[PDB]
Amino acid sequence: LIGLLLPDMSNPFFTLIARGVEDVALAHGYQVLIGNSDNDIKKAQGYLATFVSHNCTGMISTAFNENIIENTLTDHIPFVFIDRINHFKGGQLQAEVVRKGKGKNVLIVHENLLIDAFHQRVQGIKYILDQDYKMLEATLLDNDKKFIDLIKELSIDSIICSNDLLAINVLGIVQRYHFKVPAEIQIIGYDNIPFSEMTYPQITTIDQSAYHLGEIAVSQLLALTVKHRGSTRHHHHHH
Amino acid sequence: LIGLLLPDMSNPFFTLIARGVEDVALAHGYQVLIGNSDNDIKKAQGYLATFVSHNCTGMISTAFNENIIENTLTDHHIPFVFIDNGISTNHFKGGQLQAEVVRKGKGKNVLIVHENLLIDAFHQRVQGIKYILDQQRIDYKMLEATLLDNDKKFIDLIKELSIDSIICSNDLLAINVLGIVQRYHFKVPAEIQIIGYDNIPFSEMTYPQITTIDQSAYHLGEIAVSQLLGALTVKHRGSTR
Amino acid sequence: LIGLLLPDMSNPFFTLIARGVEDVALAHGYQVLIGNSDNDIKKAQGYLATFVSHNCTGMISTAFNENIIENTLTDHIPFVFIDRINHFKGGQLQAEVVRKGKGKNVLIVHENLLIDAFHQRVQGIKYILDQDYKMLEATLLDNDKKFIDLIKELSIDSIICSNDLLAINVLGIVQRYHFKVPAEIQIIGYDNIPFSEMTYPQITTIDQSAYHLGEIAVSQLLALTVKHRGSTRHHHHHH
Amino acid sequence: LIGLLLPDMSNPFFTLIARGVEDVALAHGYQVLIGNSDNDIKKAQGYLATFVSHNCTGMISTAFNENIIENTLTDHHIPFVFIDNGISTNHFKGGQLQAEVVRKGKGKNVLIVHENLLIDAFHQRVQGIKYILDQQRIDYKMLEATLLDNDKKFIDLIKELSIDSIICSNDLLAINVLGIVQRYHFKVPAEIQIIGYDNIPFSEMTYPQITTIDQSAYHLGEIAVSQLLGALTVKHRGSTR
């Protein structure tokens, strides 16, 4: 029996990892206990304690949780960290797409940097870019008027987002304020969740092979490709 | 321990229910185990056994597997609620609401793009739509959402049938459809209006935003754990006329 | 102007650090912006963003926050980590008091191991002890009946707690169920907050020089001693 | 930005107010800056300036510095609430409640161990106690809480005066007092009963637990930010007769 502690069950990237895990597991007669930590230390600790209570044979989680997972190994249970089966290189790829699209003034819209995968990605972006940008915490998208005002004041022509969910949110704000994507503002996400193929234009993104990540993770227990699409400055239209 | 068996955890309608469930559950000292049935009876059967094995004090799921759930759980004296022992808003009434928005938008040729009608919620919603459209003598055709996968063939059909209105079983279908028609240079909503269901956050992120029906998903989660232990609103938005 | 991001403003250990900081700062005409992150990544990010908004000259925080603090240094602000001005050694000292009191069956009641200071301390305990114990997450104290049942089943004679707040809670539970502290059960805390001297018996603890920590922290910006008291098995009574 | 100026953030009564303040504030999109005045006018004056400098949309503090606050803030058109423009429960009534618990416990020789009477809350509470004890012709003496620092001298006084009841300005004083008398082998409550104020969590952690007065501290924090933007209960416990 496997315990799978997901950082954000409302993120399709993680639900897809989870299906890769559940599929392989169920094939080999294994059950999975699934928990959502919401990157909350109290929730993480809660679920992990319970998964121990219930004699899990192995655990899958992200490295937000290493201290507890480690202690639970010694005190009791092998583990795999899904985020460690490279995010810095991913970030470099995002910045290189922006450069290939002739970006001059770039906004890095990021999820919480206390999450290593996000932080490492933003380090990769900065590397290529430092070789003009501003950083903006994802929560600031909530005031769309002030977001658009920033875009104008800074003459932003490129936006790099930590994942596809943020890219999609960003796309709808700038389109609702009448900017042209990609000619005026180009946008790049990460993960390649199916939502990324549903927008007009479709979101240029980095495929992390989520389903295959879950598959490998559970297999250990028992590479990145750019998707160039309409949202960046090759493909013109679909007719 | 509360066993939550979701039909599709990739759908944000269900993970929002799950949030509801989690928040009330923790406020009362419970944890929630999640299963994704992935719309599969074997998988569902697996989680029932998982949840039963691990001494869950109650189960929350949809009625898709009501027979095996009822039978296994009653035997073990474990209560259960079905979120679609019921607690849901009325899906027939929701479908009427979808069709009324279309009527108001002056819909003449309506494509009903639907999820699996094996699922009671989806099927009832469709009868809701047909109830209104038949009375109105508005023409409609029904298309299963898989046939969305080839987008050029979808467009051929839209053109041939002169579709001006599309009613979707949920917001994932509506959103997908929106991207397709926009990509083939249809104007939304003047040429084609589209309506979804669920009011997931993605529905407010598209341009135009997707007109939908909020069915109090978070609170559905809250009620289920409340019933377990002891409202429909049209969101009028840019995608409709 | 200093930003001081406290992990838990309801912990007297941190409020005392804060006074050391505020005192030295105010002496040198410096203001302090004080924020409570509650070790919540969203709160931490919120406060740190704001402290940046408001042109802080330097920041003081714990290493829960390193990724954001670091990024804010490069993008903008020097920092000091209060938890890094040794916790593993502290843990060894707690275990050595227990051994000196002839502990046989030990309960390690711990705060959240996702917090490095707590985790490192518990590693220090395990080191000495491994050279019989059970670990118990602090949240489990809430069911006092089951806590006392565990104490009985396991014949617990020693309890090591991550800090004085937990030690004090533990003391009142076992005393209300009629156990004799220290003859039947001995208890050790950490930090040496003033509450530790208020109980009967007084709580044996490890002084971290909290006020002096705050003083040093702000000074950088511009050792452990056992307190043997009544709660462990030298001093007999106060008459 | 909301400026919260606490008189003593080492006191859990105030950090609980602060939690109240933080939770409502964030729910509405605000952050809270905290200042500890450390019971000091220079420090308080510093934070007013800090909070004013940094364009706080409102201030929350105690009325200790009401004159300089009122004057500086009114000039800058910044509103403010005083948690002890007031929002508090009544401290005089709280003191009556303390003395009634003692009367019921058959108190005959009462020591009133008090915080700084410069602080209105503390002084009013003391008049509350004296109101009841005078009517009852119960004897009492007043002791400032600093003279708690030498515990053998405190005990000498307790013995000389045959004290059987101790009313404390807050739970930090009560708790300290409890440890002192217990350490010198007085039996609580049969020999000496003790009552505090505030109902901080430490009051439920001692043995015996400390009888106190809950003054809705968390909710005090909530109301203050609500007033800013737009109940007393005896807890009867083992430490009293």
CSV table of C-alpha atoms in Angstrom, one decimal, chain D residues 28-240:
chain,number,residue,atom,x,y,z
D,28,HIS,CA,-10.1,41.3,3.4
D,29,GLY,CA,-6.7,41.7,1.7
D,30,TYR,CA,-4.8,43.7,4.4
D,31,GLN,CA,-1.5,42.9,6.2
D,32,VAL,CA,-0.8,43.7,9.9
D,33,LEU,CA,2.4,45.3,11.2
D,34,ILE,CA,3.0,44.6,14.8
D,35,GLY,CA,4.7,46.8,17.3
D,36,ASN,CA,5.4,45.9,20.9
D,37,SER,CA,5.3,49.1,23.0
D,38,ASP,CA,6.9,47.0,25.8
D,39,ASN,CA,4.8,49.3,28.1
D,40,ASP,CA,6.9,52.3,27.0
D,41,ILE,CA,5.8,55.7,25.7
D,42,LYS,CA,9.0,56.3,23.6
D,43,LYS,CA,8.5,52.9,21.9
D,44,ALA,CA,4.8,53.6,21.4
D,45,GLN,CA,5.6,57.0,20.0
D,46,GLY,CA,8.1,55.3,17.7
D,47,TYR,CA,5.5,52.9,16.2
D,48,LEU,CA,2.9,55.6,15.8
D,49,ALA,CA,5.6,57.3,13.6
D,50,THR,CA,6.6,54.0,12.0
D,51,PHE,CA,2.9,53.3,11.2
D,52,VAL,CA,2.2,56.9,10.1
D,53,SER,CA,5.4,57.0,8.0
D,54,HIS,CA,4.4,53.8,6.1
D,55,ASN,CA,0.9,55.0,5.2
D,56,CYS,CA,-1.2,52.6,7.4
D,57,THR,CA,-4.9,52.9,6.6
D,58,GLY,CA,-5.7,52.4,10.3
D,59,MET,CA,-4.3,51.9,13.8
D,60,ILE,CA,-5.2,49.5,16.6
D,61,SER,CA,-3.8,49.9,20.1
D,62,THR,CA,-4.7,50.4,23.8
D,63,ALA,CA,-5.7,53.9,25.1
D,64,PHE,CA,-2.6,54.2,27.2
D,65,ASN,CA,-1.2,56.7,24.6
D,66,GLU,CA,-4.6,58.0,23.5
D,67,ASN,CA,-3.6,61.7,23.5
D,68,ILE,CA,-0.6,61.5,21.2
D,69,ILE,CA,-2.5,58.9,19.0
D,70,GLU,CA,-5.7,60.9,18.7
D,71,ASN,CA,-3.7,64.1,17.9
D,72,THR,CA,-1.3,62.6,15.4
D,73,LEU,CA,-3.9,60.4,13.6
D,74,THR,CA,-6.7,62.9,13.3
D,75,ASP,CA,-4.3,65.3,11.7
D,76,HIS,CA,-3.5,62.6,9.1
D,77,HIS,CA,-7.1,61.4,8.7
D,78,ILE,CA,-6.2,57.9,9.9
D,79,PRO,CA,-8.9,56.1,12.0
D,80,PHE,CA,-8.0,54.0,15.0
D,81,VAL,CA,-9.6,51.8,17.6
D,82,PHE,CA,-8.7,51.3,21.2
D,83,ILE,CA,-9.2,47.7,22.2
D,84,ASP,CA,-9.5,48.5,25.8
D,85,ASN,CA,-13.5,54.4,19.4
D,86,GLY,CA,-13.5,51.7,22.2
D,87,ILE,CA,-14.6,48.0,21.9
D,88,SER,CA,-13.8,46.3,25.1
D,89,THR,CA,-15.9,44.5,27.6
D,90,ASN,CA,-16.2,46.3,30.9
D,91,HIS,CA,-13.3,45.8,33.3
D,92,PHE,CA,-15.1,47.1,36.4
D,93,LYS,CA,-17.7,44.3,35.8
D,94,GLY,CA,-14.9,41.8,35.3
D,95,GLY,CA,-13.4,42.7,38.7
D,96,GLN,CA,-16.9,42.2,40.3
D,97,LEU,CA,-16.9,38.8,38.7
D,98,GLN,CA,-13.5,38.0,40.2
D,99,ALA,CA,-14.6,39.0,43.7
D,100,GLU,CA,-17.9,37.1,43.5
D,101,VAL,CA,-16.0,33.8,42.7
D,102,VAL,CA,-14.0,34.6,45.9
D,103,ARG,CA,-17.1,35.3,48.0
D,104,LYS,CA,-18.6,32.0,46.9
D,105,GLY,CA,-15.3,30.3,47.8
D,106,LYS,CA,-15.8,31.7,51.3
D,107,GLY,CA,-12.9,34.1,51.1
D,108,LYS,CA,-12.1,35.9,54.3
D,109,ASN,CA,-8.6,37.3,53.8
D,110,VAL,CA,-8.0,38.4,50.2
D,111,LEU,CA,-4.7,39.5,48.6
D,112,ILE,CA,-5.3,41.6,45.4
D,113,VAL,CA,-2.1,41.0,43.4
D,114,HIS,CA,-2.2,43.7,40.7
D,115,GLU,CA,-0.5,44.9,37.6
D,116,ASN,CA,0.3,48.5,36.9
D,117,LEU,CA,-2.7,50.7,38.0
D,118,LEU,CA,-1.5,53.3,35.5
D,119,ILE,CA,-3.4,51.1,33.0
D,120,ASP,CA,-7.1,51.9,33.0
D,121,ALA,CA,-8.2,48.3,32.5
D,122,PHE,CA,-6.2,47.1,35.5
D,123,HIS,CA,-7.3,50.0,37.7
D,124,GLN,CA,-11.1,49.6,36.8
D,125,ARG,CA,-10.9,45.9,37.4
D,126,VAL,CA,-9.5,46.6,40.9
D,127,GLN,CA,-12.4,49.0,41.7
D,128,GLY,CA,-14.7,46.2,40.6
D,129,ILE,CA,-13.2,43.8,43.1
D,130,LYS,CA,-13.2,46.4,45.9
D,131,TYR,CA,-16.9,47.2,45.1
D,132,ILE,CA,-17.9,43.7,45.9
D,133,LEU,CA,-15.5,43.0,48.8
D,134,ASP,CA,-16.4,46.3,50.6
D,135,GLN,CA,-20.2,45.5,50.5
D,136,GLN,CA,-19.3,42.0,51.8
D,137,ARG,CA,-17.0,43.4,54.5
D,138,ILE,CA,-14.4,40.9,53.3
D,139,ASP,CA,-10.8,42.1,54.3
D,140,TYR,CA,-8.3,42.6,51.5
D,141,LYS,CA,-4.8,44.0,51.0
D,142,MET,CA,-3.3,45.2,47.7
D,143,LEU,CA,0.2,43.9,46.5
D,144,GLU,CA,2.0,45.1,43.4
D,145,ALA,CA,3.0,42.1,41.2
D,146,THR,CA,6.7,43.1,41.2
D,147,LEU,CA,7.0,42.1,44.8
D,148,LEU,CA,6.3,38.5,43.5
D,149,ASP,CA,10.0,38.4,42.3
D,150,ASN,CA,11.3,37.4,45.9
D,151,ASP,CA,9.2,34.4,46.6
D,152,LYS,CA,10.1,33.8,50.2
D,153,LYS,CA,9.1,37.4,51.1
D,154,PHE,CA,5.8,36.8,49.4
D,155,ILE,CA,5.2,33.7,51.5
D,156,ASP,CA,6.1,35.5,54.7
D,157,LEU,CA,3.3,38.0,53.8
D,158,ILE,CA,0.8,35.3,52.9
D,159,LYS,CA,1.4,33.6,56.3
D,160,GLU,CA,1.3,36.8,58.4
D,161,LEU,CA,-1.9,38.0,56.8
D,162,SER,CA,-3.5,34.4,56.8
D,163,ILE,CA,-4.4,34.9,53.1
D,164,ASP,CA,-6.9,32.3,51.8
D,165,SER,CA,-7.8,34.0,48.5
D,166,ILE,CA,-5.7,35.7,45.8
D,167,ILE,CA,-7.2,37.7,43.0
D,168,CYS,CA,-4.8,38.5,40.2
D,169,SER,CA,-5.0,41.1,37.4
D,170,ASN,CA,-4.3,38.5,34.8
D,171,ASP,CA,-3.5,34.8,34.2
D,172,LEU,CA,0.3,35.4,34.0
D,173,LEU,CA,0.1,36.8,37.6
D,174,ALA,CA,-2.2,33.9,38.8
D,175,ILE,CA,0.0,31.3,37.3
D,176,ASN,CA,3.1,32.7,38.8
D,177,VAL,CA,1.4,33.0,42.2
D,178,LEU,CA,0.1,29.3,41.9
D,179,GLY,CA,3.7,28.1,41.4
D,180,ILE,CA,4.9,30.1,44.4
D,181,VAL,CA,2.3,28.9,46.9
D,182,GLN,CA,2.6,25.3,45.7
D,183,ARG,CA,6.3,25.3,45.9
D,184,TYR,CA,6.0,26.4,49.6
D,185,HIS,CA,3.4,23.6,50.2
D,186,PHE,CA,0.2,25.5,50.4
D,187,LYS,CA,-2.8,23.5,49.2
D,188,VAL,CA,-4.8,25.0,46.4
D,189,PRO,CA,-7.7,25.6,46.6
D,190,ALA,CA,-8.5,24.4,50.1
D,191,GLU,CA,-5.9,26.6,51.8
D,192,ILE,CA,-5.4,29.3,49.1
D,193,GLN,CA,-7.7,29.9,46.2
D,194,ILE,CA,-6.5,31.9,43.2
D,195,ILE,CA,-8.3,33.6,40.3
D,196,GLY,CA,-6.8,35.2,37.2
D,197,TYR,CA,-8.2,37.0,34.1
D,198,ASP,CA,-8.0,36.6,30.3
D,199,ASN,CA,-8.4,32.8,30.0
D,200,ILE,CA,-5.0,32.4,28.2
D,201,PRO,CA,-4.2,28.7,27.2
D,202,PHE,CA,-1.6,28.4,30.0
D,203,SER,CA,-4.5,28.8,32.5
D,204,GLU,CA,-5.9,25.4,31.4
D,205,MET,CA,-2.3,23.8,31.6
D,206,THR,CA,-1.5,24.1,35.3
D,207,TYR,CA,-2.6,21.7,37.9
D,208,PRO,CA,-5.0,22.7,39.3
D,209,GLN,CA,-6.2,24.6,36.3
D,210,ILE,CA,-6.6,28.4,36.9
D,211,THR,CA,-10.1,29.8,37.4
D,212,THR,CA,-10.2,32.9,35.2
D,213,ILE,CA,-12.5,35.3,33.2
D,214,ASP,CA,-12.6,34.8,29.4
D,215,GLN,CA,-13.0,38.2,27.7
D,216,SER,CA,-13.3,37.1,24.1
D,217,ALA,CA,-9.8,38.1,23.1
D,218,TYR,CA,-9.7,36.6,19.6
D,219,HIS,CA,-13.1,38.2,18.8
D,220,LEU,CA,-11.9,41.5,20.4
D,221,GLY,CA,-9.3,41.4,17.6
D,222,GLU,CA,-11.9,40.7,15.0
D,223,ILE,CA,-14.2,43.6,16.1
D,224,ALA,CA,-11.4,46.0,16.2
D,225,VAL,CA,-10.5,45.5,12.5
D,226,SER,CA,-14.2,45.4,11.7
D,227,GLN,CA,-14.8,48.7,13.5
D,228,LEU,CA,-11.5,50.0,11.9
D,229,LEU,CA,-12.5,49.2,8.3
D,230,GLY,CA,-16.3,49.1,8.3
D,231,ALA,CA,-18.9,38.7,26.4
D,232,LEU,CA,-17.3,38.0,29.8
D,233,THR,CA,-17.5,34.4,31.0
D,234,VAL,CA,-16.3,33.0,34.4
D,235,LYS,CA,-14.3,29.8,33.8
D,236,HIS,CA,-14.8,27.9,37.1
D,237,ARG,CA,-11.8,25.6,37.6
D,238,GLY,CA,-9.8,23.7,40.2
D,239,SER,CA,-7.9,26.7,41.6
D,240,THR,CA,-11.0,28.1,43.5
